[PDB]
Every structure is written in structure tokens, then in C-alpha cells.
Amino acid sequence: KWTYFGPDGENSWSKKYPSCGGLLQSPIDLHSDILQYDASLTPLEFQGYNLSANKQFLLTNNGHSVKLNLPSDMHIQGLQSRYSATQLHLHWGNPNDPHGSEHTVSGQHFAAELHIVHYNSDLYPDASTASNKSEGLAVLAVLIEMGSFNPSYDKIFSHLQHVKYKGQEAFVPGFNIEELLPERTAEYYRYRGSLTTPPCNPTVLWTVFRNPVQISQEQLLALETALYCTHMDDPSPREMINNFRQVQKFDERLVYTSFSQ
Amino acid sequence: KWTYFGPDGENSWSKKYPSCGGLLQSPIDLHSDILQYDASLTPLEFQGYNLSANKQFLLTNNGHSVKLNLPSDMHIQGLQSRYSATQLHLHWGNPNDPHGSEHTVSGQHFAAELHIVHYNSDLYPDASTASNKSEGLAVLAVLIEMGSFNPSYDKIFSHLQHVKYKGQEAFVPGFNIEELLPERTAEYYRYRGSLTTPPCNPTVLWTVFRNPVQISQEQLLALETALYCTHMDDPSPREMINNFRQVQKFDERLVYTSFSQ
Ligand SMILES: CCCSc1c(F)c(F)c(S(N)(=O)=O)c(F)c1F
Ligand SMILES: CCCSc1c(F)c(F)c(S(N)(=O)=O)c(F)c1F
Ligand SMILES: [Zn+2]
Ligand SMILES: [Zn+2]
């Protein structure tokens, strides 16, 4: 299958996933020349993010990232349709170059990036059906930098020990996913783009929050060193690192901002 | 018929040109995490760069860039073989976004980039042979920023309305090519990489000078509006703009610097 390195890496995804060589590809560099304040971009409302402490949510190593399944009563309010959550996951670099966000800001990577994936549940029955359809998906992106310890991110990272290898699964008790969001969620970048992984469908409404979150140096190192892409029994193990796509060309287009200041 | 934009752009190159999806791809972002000083990287000497003004050298629009043919008596001294020149060419952006270098430094693009292409003439009889052999080619890269008018670059640019279309050829009087190089050529980045266009062979020893040169806004605009990828009779003309590849992953690779600091 597809990978982020070697022969099956991102320059080859378009052979078997043609949309990876098509229009509206993500991620992109967010830089001042292409930003345009749009007073119409009002705050999102995060509904059902306070997950029941009494419910468990499936965490998976899928060989590409670590993903947490989310329930479809969790949703964003504010967009043209209701977009219901389906999963969250992360992208990161490696300890020798700990700059593995997908989006960049003025050419600079952040340490990592969290994506909370939602689908248009007013139009489609599930995310897998929505993903290749018009208006199918909305992703929230949180940029992550090393700083202070983050107890909320640790509600996910304390389980990394149990999803070390591809295919492994663990259960995470519900917690308030809004705790993973940064300060001043009113401030964000917005643009139409794509999945950043195969099949790269150009069906994502992106919201990248302006302000990053922090996690400690030990948390970032844990994220970068805890997982493998490969199955446990693989005689040639591969660490799960550098699981981000390079930025894409983005020309004659704008990213709209909810902030002018 | 590869291009820099649209269906046949760079995410699709690897469909026809397998090395574009292979190892050792160029260009790259030059940033601190991947740099290491190497005291062995001693100064290059540029020999036979002062081309006779009474001779002329062929300028050709090859559908992807503009190239100036260079004589094989022009060479670099200081590498492990003699590398003789074959051609130079440029990469650039567009009038509304004059940010088209290939290499970036700490996430920033420069306005344009000059490549002076050499081949190992000790080992091979011509650059096309050398180009499919490891370390067969050595390319010098000069980063170009918007700044003062540059008379020396204008010795090339003044001939562009004469090679606007694919297949057209002009003659440029000899001049001193060293005038295209920046200050303190002793300061450079060195790494093993590839051609930045199809067929992307991983056969280039790159030298990117630390210091940029300047050309004016007017020179950039001329460059960015002069040229077409297509023939003069093509009913579907395409402007030669934005002819730079995105930066490539470079992990496990290190870039060696002839400067500490
Ligand atoms: C079918 C529903 C989830 S698949 C998926 C995905 F894996 C992503 F990485 C992304 S990403 N990285 O673009 O957020 C995504 F948007 C997705 F939709
Ligand atoms: C002998 C090789 C002919 S094709 C070629 C080239 F000459 C370059 F200089 C480059 S560059 N841009 O790497 O200098 C390139 F990409 C090419 F594909
Ligand atoms: Zn993602
Ligand atoms: Zn070039």
C-alpha cells in the first residue's frame, strides 16, 4: 500500500490514487500574501465533544497514524450542513527533525498536527460514503508545538503503549475532545482542499486554528517513538515517523481568515 | 508533456518517470536540523567561465525553462573529478507571485534560482551519458532575490523575447558567467540529490551557494512574462511560469555546509 517513505511514498500516490495528482490538494503553506479576512467566518460550535466517561472509544494504529474513533452524535454546528465526527488522528516528524505538521505557517512547520475528521451527515450516511462526494468532509486542524505538559493530550498518549504495531487496538474512555483545541478557536484559517492521505479526494473543508497547542518535550518524543507502521511480526520493522505530506502548490487562490488582527 | 501545473504536474511525474518517486530527490528545504558543517568542503574554482564576448552561445527554449549552452572548456576545479559545464537555466514564479526558487532556506522561497549544470567529463563523453550515472552531474545553484538591477543576468534576459516559444533558439554573446555567482562562493551547502525535473535521476552532486544574488522587479517580470512552454503556432498556449518543483522529503539525508555558522 501507500507509505510516506521509499518507493510507495507521496510522489507515487497518484498512480493508484489519481486524485492525489488532481485539483485542490492539501496541505498548503498559510502565508500572508494569500490570506484574506472574511467577516463571514463566525465561530464554530462543538457539540457532543464532551464524550461520555462511561463509553469507550476505539484507538487504532492503522499503519499510517494513530486514530481515535468518534461517535456520530459529536458534530460541528455553524457550517452549511451538520458535519458529524468520525475519527481523529495525528501527523508528526521525528526526533532528529521534530517538525512534522502538515500545514505550515509562513513556511514554518509546527511539531505535529491533530486532525478531527467530520463528514456531512445531512447528505451521507457515513464518512466512507461521504469521503469522495461533494461537500463530503470537514476537518479541524490543530497545530502542535513543544511547551508545557498537556494533560488532555495525555488522555490519548497514555494509550500509545497498547497500539504500538499496525492493526493493534485499544479503548479510550470518553473525555472532552474540546480540551484538545487551542485558545481562541474563533480565530482560524479556512479553505477548500483535500484529504492529505490517499485517496486525496478534493472534498475537505479545512479549518486550521490560528493558535497552536503545547505538549511537553516528553509527550512529543513519545508520539514520535511509540509506534510502528508495521505488524508486530514483521521481520523488517519500520518506525512510524514523518507521517505528513509535503505542502502542495496553491496558486491564484485565497485562504480566508476569521481574524484580521 | 510533463508540466508544472495541472493533470501532468509534479505529483504525476512518477507515472512516466519512475525515478521521480525514488530516492535522493531534489530540491529540499535547507534548515538547521539537517545541516552539518564539514571542514573538508574547500572552495571551488571556476575555470573558463569568462566566455569570449566575440563568441556566441546558444540560448534555447526547451518547453520547461530557458537554457544557455556552455562550452566544455568551462569547468569546476575542486571536486573529485573535473566537471565541465554543459548548460545553465533558471526556475521562477509568476508576475503576481515572484517566489519560484526550487531550494528553500528555513522554509522561505527566493524569487528565482539559477542552475549551472556540469558533468563528469573525466568519466563521460557528454552530460546525457553522465546523467544516468551516480555523481555524474554537479549542479551549482544560485538563489535569486528581488533587489537591484543586475546587468550580468540581463545579458541572458535581454534575449528572451527571442526564444519565447518551444524550439526557438537565439545566440547570446559570451560574458563572464562568474558574474552570475554571489558573494563568498566559498560558503555553500552540499548534498547528493537529483535532477529536479523528469526524469529525476538521483545523479546530482548539488552545491547551493549560501548567499543570494539580486535581480530587479522589472527583470523578474520580464522573465516571468517572456516565455511559453508551447510552440509558436500551438492553439492552446501555456505560459512558462511557476517552473519549480516543491521541496522533497529529506530524512536520513544530511546537507553539509562549508560554513559553521
Ligand atoms: C473516511 C473518513 C476518514 S479517512 C481520512 C484520513 F485518514 C485522513 F488522514 C484525513 S486528513 N489527514 O486529510 O485529515 C481525512 F480527512 C480523512 F477523511
Ligand atoms: C543532462 C540532464 C538533462 S535533463 C535536466 C538537466 F539538465 C538539469 F540540469 C536539471 S536541474 N533542474 O536539476 O538542474 C534537470 F532537472 C534536468 F532534468
Ligand atoms: Zn490528517
Ligand atoms: Zn534546474
Swiss-Prot record, chains A, B:
This protein's name: Carbonic anhydrase 12
GO molecular function, one term: carbonate dehydratase activity
Tissue specificity note: Highly expressed in colon, kidney, prostate, intestine and activated lymphocytes. Expressed at much higher levels in the renal cell cancers than in surrounding normal kidney tissue. Moderately expressed in pancreas, ovary and testis. Expressed in sweat glands and bronchiolar epithelium.
Entry annotation: catalytic residues: H64
Positions of Zn(2+) binding: H89, H91, H115
EC number(s) recorded for this UniProt protein: 4.2.1.1
GO cellular component: apical plasma membrane; basolateral plasma membrane; membrane; plasma membrane
Gene: CA12
Disulfide bonds: C20-C200
Domain Alpha-carbonic anhydrase span(s) in chain numbering: 1-259
Gene Ontology biological-process entries: chloride ion homeostasis; estrous cycle
Subcellular location as annotated: Membrane; Cell membrane
Residues of the full protein shown: 31 to 291 of 354
Organism of this sequence: Homo sapiens
Subunit structure: Homodimer.
